[PDB]
Design a protein around this ligand. Sequence first.
Ligand SMILES: Nc1ncnc2c1ncn2[C@@H]1O[C@H](COP(=O)(O)OP(=O)(O)OP(=O)(O)O)[C@@H](O)[C@H]1O
Ligand SMILES: Nc1ncnc2c1ncn2[C@@H]1O[C@H](COP(=O)(O)OP(=O)(O)O)[C@@H](O)[C@H]1O
Ligand SMILES: Nc1ncnc2c1ncn2[C@@H]1O[C@H](COP(=O)(O)OP(=O)(O)O)[C@@H](O)[C@H]1O
Ligand SMILES: Nc1ncnc2c1ncn2[C@@H]1O[C@H](COP(=O)(O)OP(=O)(O)O)[C@@H](O)[C@H]1O
Ligand SMILES: [Zn+2]
Ligand SMILES: [Zn+2]
Lengths: 183, 564, 716
Amino acid sequence: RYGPLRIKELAVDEELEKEDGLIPRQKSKLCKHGDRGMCEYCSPLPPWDKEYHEKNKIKHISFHSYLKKLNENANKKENGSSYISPLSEPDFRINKRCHNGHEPWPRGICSKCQPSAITLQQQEFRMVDHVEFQKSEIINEFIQAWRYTGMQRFGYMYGSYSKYDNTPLGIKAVVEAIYEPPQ
Amino acid sequence: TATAILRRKKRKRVVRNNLRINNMNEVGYDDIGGCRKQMAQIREMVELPLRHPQLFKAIGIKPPRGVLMYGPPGTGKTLMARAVANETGAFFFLINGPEVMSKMAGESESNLRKAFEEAEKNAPAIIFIDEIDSIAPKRDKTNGEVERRVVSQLLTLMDGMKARSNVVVIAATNRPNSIDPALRRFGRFDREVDIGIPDATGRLEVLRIHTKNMKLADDVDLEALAAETHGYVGADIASLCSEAAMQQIREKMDLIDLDEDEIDAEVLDSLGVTMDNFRFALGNSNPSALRETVVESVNVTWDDVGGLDEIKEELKETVEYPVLHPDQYTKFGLSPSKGVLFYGPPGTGKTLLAKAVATEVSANFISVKGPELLSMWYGESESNIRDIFDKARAAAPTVVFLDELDSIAKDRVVNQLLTEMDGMNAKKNVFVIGATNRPDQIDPAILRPGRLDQLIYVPLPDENARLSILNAQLRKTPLEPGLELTAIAKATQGFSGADLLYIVQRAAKYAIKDSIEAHRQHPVPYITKEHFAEAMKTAKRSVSDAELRRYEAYSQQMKASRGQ
Amino acid sequence: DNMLLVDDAINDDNSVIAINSNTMDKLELFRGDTVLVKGKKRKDTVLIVLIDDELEDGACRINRVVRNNLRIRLGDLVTIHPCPDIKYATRISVLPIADTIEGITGNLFDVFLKPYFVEAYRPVRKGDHFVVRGGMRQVEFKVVDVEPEEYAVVAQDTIIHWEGEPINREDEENNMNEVGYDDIGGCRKQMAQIREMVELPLRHPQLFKAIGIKPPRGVLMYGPPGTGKTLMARAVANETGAFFFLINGPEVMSKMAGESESNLRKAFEEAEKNAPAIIFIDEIDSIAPKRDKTNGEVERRVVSQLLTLMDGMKARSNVVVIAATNRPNSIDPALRRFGRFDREVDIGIPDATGRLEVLRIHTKNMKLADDVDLEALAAETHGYVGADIASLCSEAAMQQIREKMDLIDLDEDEIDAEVLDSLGVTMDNFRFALGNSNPSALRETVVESVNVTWDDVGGLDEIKEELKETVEYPVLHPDQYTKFGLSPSKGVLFYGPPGTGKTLLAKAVATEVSANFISVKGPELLSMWYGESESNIRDIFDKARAAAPTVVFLDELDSIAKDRVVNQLLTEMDGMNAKKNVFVIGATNRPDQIDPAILRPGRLDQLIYVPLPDENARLSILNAQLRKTPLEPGLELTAIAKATQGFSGADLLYIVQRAAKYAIKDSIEAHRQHPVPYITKEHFAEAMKTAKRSVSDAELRRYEAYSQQMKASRGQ
Ligand SMILES: Nc1ncnc2c1ncn2[C@@H]1O[C@H](COP(=O)(O)OP(=O)(O)OP(=O)(O)O)[C@@H](O)[C@H]1O
Ligand SMILES: Nc1ncnc2c1ncn2[C@@H]1O[C@H](COP(=O)(O)OP(=O)(O)O)[C@@H](O)[C@H]1O
Ligand SMILES: Nc1ncnc2c1ncn2[C@@H]1O[C@H](COP(=O)(O)OP(=O)(O)O)[C@@H](O)[C@H]1O
Ligand SMILES: Nc1ncnc2c1ncn2[C@@H]1O[C@H](COP(=O)(O)OP(=O)(O)O)[C@@H](O)[C@H]1O
Ligand SMILES: [Zn+2]
Ligand SMILES: [Zn+2]
């Protein structure tokens, strides 16, 4: 598309993408240089710094920061490429239409449309960070259902998203009410 | 019954199009030419085990499974594989070499495992491991651990495959020796096929196959192009045609205005390739097969060489009778001779004798020039003596012409050659013909029985032989009517064939000089006798008296030592 | 017809074009009609047509801004087409230029743009520039985004989003991509090759459909570094207007393990999905080096992935892959066969005209002084690739700044504009830069061009005739050779005393047939023999083939003809196609020392003796070497030539050089004492007194004996 794709998403994502999340740092006692100029320890900390997280007891990296990491890792400006899109969701369905000369999958398959081995590995970015309940009554009544009847329950929860300062470029889902389907 | 299978679309105006009479795959046997024997072998090895499995149940044997094709790149190995796979109409699993090697570590074995497992589940199946050399190079070539894991996985899958399951494995590789040796044993890629560069008729067939859609101008002489192209592989011919079309469009581009996206329909419909375009494309093109040793047929009879009748009869007795009439040899229990060694002054036509011998027995011809021998000695050439004789075996019957043995036989290479020749199968028709201008310097070990022991002297051309050579060389050149060459032949006593070639080339040079001068002035379409006189005034012998005396003395010594 | 002549419009409106009444009638246009105007580099804009009879028939008037946007100058031609399907801009998002908004208070939009577009209905397209004159200020802007795309009419109800940060001006200039052919000179042949191999497959696909062939895909440009390969590829891609997809080598190879392959796959997928496309793989040698180089698995997976992608694109897709490498042998051999980079292009150092064109191209923004003789610099700069010329210009500018540094205060951060006005480069600065420049192209074998004719060689009439009939006829009249079935002679071997001027004969032969000349001196041959050089005989002959019709020249071949190198040379000579116009000219001083194998037919068979110059030849050489030197009027060189019997060309050059040395010494002494602008005869007399022959009589007798032996060998 000669550049970034054009599409509209939630306001939270837009405002998050506006920011940078750089975590400033002061002159470490290990620096050897004048006031101005920064060597390797006084440089701003990127929002996706793994050491900072595990040192702060944060287990995943606040997906927007993961997007910042991926954009920094590649996509040089003004040259070097034409903006290869950084994110792509996994897809394991076999391409029914490859045709190097072979027929569809049921009776033929080349080495180009053969789903390669899948390597499971624990994810590192959690899209939504903090789930927050406006009032404890929302879940108290839900549990009260089981209290009275004794049977289990199940219900969808409605709400909206917002920023979450406690984690670098983090998101919170604020739930306002719970709705119970017929089960 | 050499084929017995070829003798009798693609499992399929509107009706003809539907019946087939960018992804236009399923190329049938019609889309291949010049490799009839190899295609016959592949069909015999692939169809019958799958199409008609009951034959082997009836006769009570297990049909072979491992087929390995190797030949110069661009000869159409993948084309033949895909054609056979689509014609048989069986579950066809295609494994690329580089594509499998491009996966992460550990994901390049699972692909092979699942490929073979699927081929087993949906039998009958054909598995074509293209460019197997990329996933199984020579043992010393690669030492990486993953390169050994993949090879071991391939070997395990291949060995475990051998069962009643109707699955056939086909592999391709340009260099026969590149593949790991362990892949060429029993229960593995045992049957081997060698692809050789096509001959004149094969080149014409390829040209017709490719040049069936071009808007060729009516003045095209595809026969002439086929004759001119010597050593052109199929890919080279395709590139030739593409470049000729490019030249035609470039010439027509003058009327085309690049500014406009579209072009006038009349101009677009006036495109046509002319013979000069093909000539220009031939000028630009550059074949690559000849850089390495390959297999090519030859069609020289006992008429392009003059004289040497006694030597011709000796060669006949040596080579022709065992191949044509092995039954009488079996009756007498005498095995035929292995090799022969031609020696004599340079330029006497030893190569022509070798080619004639190869043609008489209808055997393929392999050539090894002196520079190839030196390059192998220095170990900077991809090929190897073992590879040469492996291809000779795979393409039997064959005639291997070892030229300029003096360079190496002034040794590691000589030892390898001796071992390979000794290990040659007695009954397998693999003849070796050695050429050398210094029979004294040749290592005697090569002359022992069971080796190149049959020495043959090649004398300088005789007067009648010189006349015949001169007639043969000048037949395809416009000469003056009523022109006599007997006087020139008589005046050229002691001249070698190369000397006569030089004389005729000088005459042609003078003729072209005069023609160009006339064109500039404006005439001389023939080679008048004055041109011959002018050329003869300059040309002269290339063999010194001492050389002839030495050769005669050596031949006389050989005659004396062979009789009393 | 519609190729309206460009003219400077009187009005400053950014969406108004004035045309003559006659043209308006011819194209059926009318006043107030919105039309699409296309100029150069495929630039397009939408302009409101207005009738104006002052302009001559077929001429149109446009303002400075529109001309800048179209990248065309006054007097050019613009094509005008109807634009009836232009809708009103639903929303235009525009930001101003930072420099143009400095010192502006209040809302910029209300002050400037609010009256400009209201009741104007000006058609605006993305990437255009429009300037508004408000009050005492004039501000330029950019059409960042228009809805609907790509262009639309800004109506009264159109919503204008001016919110956003200022846009820096430097981006447009210092990122000057979209460079056309006007920025490249001296490489017309290779540019034409790339054009015919790229544009036609993309711009006019129907040609190959009508003919019925699959156009070639790969293209491999190579040559000395700094010759502008990347610039040529960029220019071709921009001119074509295709979906250019530059891929770097170092950029790909610097990714984490298991990521470079993904980048290659994504790049090829993106190019395929947006056909047509032009994938440009710069510095491919870093991605796919030679096999004997790095053997690591990470260095193999990338090559295999590239091969798979190359073999996977063979389809109806209109994708062209262009790769750039320094040498042909550095790339993995698997990438130079059918279905892959099968078409080669060779870049060679430019000639004098090329250097002059490069100097003009680079030195168009410099504040050059009047005393500029660019032709002189082009003549004096030999072997300077484009990068060297750019460095030369930069160094000259820096030297000029240094010279004018006297009136500059480093401590003070403000510099008077008058001082900057006085800045100007001079010929002295350029000569200083040439003194300090360090070219490096010639250190390796490189294709070059020579322009020596049959006038810098004295005498040798019979040898010249032989060379003509040997080389000129095959190249110019191949039809005759085909008619007579005679195969052209491959090469010839010169032999004779050193200094006779064999290189001059080789260059003359190359010039006559207009063939690029490749030179390989003795040191290069020995370095290849020892295996510590960066080039191989195979590489030399590959470059010769790709740059045909070429002329390869081997010098002092006896040093190597005393052999693996000779074996490789023989193999390459056997390999070359006869019809290919490649001639190998060997030179040596001890012909009998040459290996006999090199002299066999089908190789360097023809042997040519190069004799010492004759008296008339000596006079011709003296005159030729003294053409650009001030001689004493009335001086005749006939006596000096007569006194120099048996002297080779090098001897005469030595004599001339000594005479010039004496003259310059006398001039320096006279000036220091304070004249002799030319060279007097006494200087030449002293030089002759200090003369010395370079060839002993015994060697001359040996050469004559060898010549007589050769003649007798062909005499009967
Ligand atoms: N009879 C033929 N023999 C050889 N080539 C042919 C023939 N007919 C057509 N060709 C063309 O020759 C080229 C052969 O390409 P192909 O991929 O088969 O070669 P290859 O070097 O054997 O392949 P690889 O080793 O990559 O599998 C193709 O252009 C094919 O169209
Ligand atoms: N009867 C013949 N005797 C000798 N030379 C011949 C004869 N017929 C053809 N020739 C010529 O001999 C040349 C082949 O040379 P050849 O003898 O193979 O060289 P070498 O002896 O070095 O192998 C061809 O160019 C061909 O024109
Ligand atoms: N016509 C030209 N020919 C050659 N070089 C040119 C030309 N015009 C400009 N140059 C300059 O020559 C250099 C070319 O760089 P180039 O060799 O293409 O880089 P790369 O190493 O990426 O191939 C640049 O500095 C460019 O500005
Ligand atoms: N007609 C001529 N004959 C001989 N030498 C000439 C002639 N014209 C110029 N020269 C000079 O002869 C020199 C030849 O140099 P070089 O190539 O090193 O030796 P050689 O020509 O013997 O190989 C050149 O420097 C050139 O100036
Ligand atoms: Zn610091
Ligand atoms: Zn597939």
